[PDB]
Amino acid sequence: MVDAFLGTWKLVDSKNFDDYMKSLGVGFATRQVASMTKPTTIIEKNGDILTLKTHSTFKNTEISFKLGVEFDETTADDRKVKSIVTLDGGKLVHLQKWDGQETTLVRELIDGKLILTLTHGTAVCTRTYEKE
Ligand SMILES: CCCCC/C=C\C/C=C\CCCCCCCC(=O)O
Asked: Which residues carry this modification: N-acetylvaline?
């Protein structure tokens, strides 16, 4: 049911990522480098366990999770969060909670592109990935 999200994806557009990073308290030097980084995201499944890798020249992450089951996560910017990833209206919705704060990372497929919408506070970032 998540199968169309599976594969290797490369960043091809980014809007308002600096705003999103600023909202999370990311320092200017990290924002600078991140603004010029194009990650590759790899989404794999093995039964109902998904693994989502984000690789780049700057930072790398990897999470594994079951849909609908909370997991601990330590984000690229070193937040220690409680996370859950579900399918909602055909979109893969990742919610992170820490210290009463929350952020959503929503992935949807539009015309074969994967669109990642990041929301924290008032900041809304839209990043577009294309399939490799
Ligand atoms: C792991 C790759 C990180 C690339 C940016 C570099 C540093 C991290 C700074 C802020 C992290 C915010 C959460 C990371 C969001 C990655 C978004 C994406 O998946 O496009």
From this structure: 2
CATH number of 3-131: 2.40.128.20
Distance 55 CA to ligand 1 centre (A): 9
Token pair recorded at residue 103: 């952020």
Percent helix, strand, coil in the chain, to 5, is: 15, 60, 30
Using the mean position of ligand 1's atoms as its centre, give its distance from the Cα of residue 100 in Å: 21
- What is the experimental method? X-ray
37 C-alpha vs ligand 1 centroid, how far in Å? 9
**Atom 19 (ligand 1) nearest CA:** 54
The token duo for 56 is: 């780049």
Rounded CA-CA distance 75/58 in Å is 14
Place of tokens 């809304």: 124
Resolution of the solved structure (Å): 0.9
Nearest CA to ligand 1 atom 10: 77
Cβ atoms 109, 128 nearer than 8 A = no
* Domains of the chain, residue spans: 3-131
Consult the annotation and say whether 20 binds a ligand.
no
